[PDB]
Design a protein around this ligand. Structure first.
Ligand SMILES: [Fe+3]
Ligand SMILES: [Fe+3]
Ligand SMILES: [Fe+3]
Ligand SMILES: [Fe+3]
Ligand SMILES: [Fe+3]
Ligand SMILES: [Fe+3]
Ligand SMILES: [Fe+3]
Ligand SMILES: [Fe+3]
Ligand SMILES: [Fe+3]
Ligand SMILES: [Fe+3]
Lengths: 171, 171, 171, 171
């Protein structure tokens, strides 16, 4: 059963946030580990990242935030709406005011790529509240700007300008 | 250049935290979607999670926290030590005092399964600054509690008693 | 009109928190300043603390949480209930587990003296929704572990045992 | 002895923040209460606010953040520098971007009056490390924009435009 007392709820939320941070950091370290002359350290990094994922999933289930697929899609829709309507524009404008190139560039990349996720989730929710699965194949993702390309893949990136060969395929 | 202003650094740290949380949530959503008759929505969730990973990696690179393997290995060691020694016993004590079965069980699993990551990382560091690669193969991870079993794997999980075949191998 | 946007609401809440912390810090600084040989620096600290109070009051008015007293007492009642019931026992248990004399002593002084505020506020609210002011006089307070003594004053503080002459009277 | 373990430090810092918030809220409620037909409610509000101040002071001393006046003034100097350089300009620009009148007005009042506090603290500090007290009298504070006037007080407020009769005297 979901926890009700406030303090244990706060503690579990903080634990989930920490475990997610740890898993993401380990994933980031693994890429550089495999990019250097130590191919077998990325194995350990990915295994322990999976362990942190398991811990975070256990914490998430403990709070009882998981339901059916339509509710998960609704939560994703709300999260995506908050990430490209309120947070990122303000962060980009603050970074412009303070005058630093890297933060402005990163938020520029992240600001223009999040507008599609909400549409995809809404389509999935409209097609999932009845008993049927959507049709999709060979989703392309950029490794430099995170740009969701569905089915067809543009020859060059309309955000950074990377060639189509550089993309990663999820099928 | 690395971000030196305080407000932009705080903004980017919060954005990194949000992206990591979103990526973890999307991975959990995909895991749930595989369990129902929607194999394609799991693909969509995985692709969007990889996009969130790219966003968070760009945010992490902007802050300049990434370097060579010894430094991020030491960072992982510090994080694991902090997680095992201080936070988890306190959370377990608080959950025991308030009296939630789920929080106590999850914290018990976490504090009993997280003890080996620090030792593994500590050993690995003193070989990744001289120039060689670690000799570890075929790592095992439990899918319920998450206990890193290196090379050989026990017949049953000492923490939860899961069968051997349930283990997720990495090689 | 009240502030409706989420991001700027969060910004104003954080600013209010910072102003309150600064005002508390200045009020604490003034007491030590007057304890030494500088009676004018205490005056400067008091004036600057009042300026911070004005800032925080403006921030509070902007967010729109201040209104008529009959409904205003409810926020204080809820805050006192949360402080006495949930937050403080957990902190006391954690400080006992980690083993710090100062934290345990401070929490023990805290939870045992915060119990009367909720009762006083409930009585004030249920006597003050008809247009009449409550009949109360000479509220006493201990200067070490403040225990809200109403009207009459005990000879010694039941919590710390301080003499009666040290009580700070309000009239 | 100062608290050294991390979790107790976090808990005590959160408690201090909560107590400061409670004190400020109670002060504002008292000021509203005395503005209407109930005079004696403000007495109770101010008494319990003093109790919250005592609790916050105990928590602050527990973390051992208090020293002599020379070093005490440094914390105020740094706080004012951060408040007037980083936080308020960014908050004002964000409020301008989102387009709300109240937040822009409050931040405009706040950012134009905090520049003199750092100078006052520095002037007090240079005279404090030698062993003597500064000379100051009749400090005026505006009650609708927080504006520190030293000795002489202008006829009209150069920020809001209030007459010099409305000010409050801190002697
Ligand atoms: Fe963990
Ligand atoms: Fe996103
Ligand atoms: Fe791209
Ligand atoms: Fe297990
Ligand atoms: Fe301020
Ligand atoms: Fe209280
Ligand atoms: Fe007492
Ligand atoms: Fe209180
Ligand atoms: Fe200030
Ligand atoms: Fe003014």
């Amino acid at each position: 059963m979901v926890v009700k007392r406030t303090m244990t709820k706060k503690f579990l939320e903080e634990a989930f946030a920490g475990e997610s941070m740890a898993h993401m950091r380990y994933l980031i370290f693994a890429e550089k580990a495999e990019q250097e002359g130590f191919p077998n350290i990325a194995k350990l990094f990915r295994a322990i990242a999976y362990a942190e994922f398991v811990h975070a999933k256990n914490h998430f289930i403990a709070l009882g935030k998981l339901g059916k697929t339509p509710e998960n899609l609704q939560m994703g829709i709300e999260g995506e709406t908050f990430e490209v309507e309120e947070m990122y524009p303000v962060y980009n404008k603050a970074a412009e005011f303070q005058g630093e190139k890297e933060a402005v560039r990163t938020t520029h990349y992240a600001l223009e790529a999040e507008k599609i996720h909400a549409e995809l989730y809404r389509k999935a929710k409209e097609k999932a509240e009845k008993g049927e699965d959507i049709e999709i194949k060979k989703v392309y993702i950029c490794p430099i700007c995170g740009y969701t390309a569905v089915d067809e893949a543009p020859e060059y990136c309309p955000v950074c300008g990377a060639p189509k060969e550089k993309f990663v395929v999820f099928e």
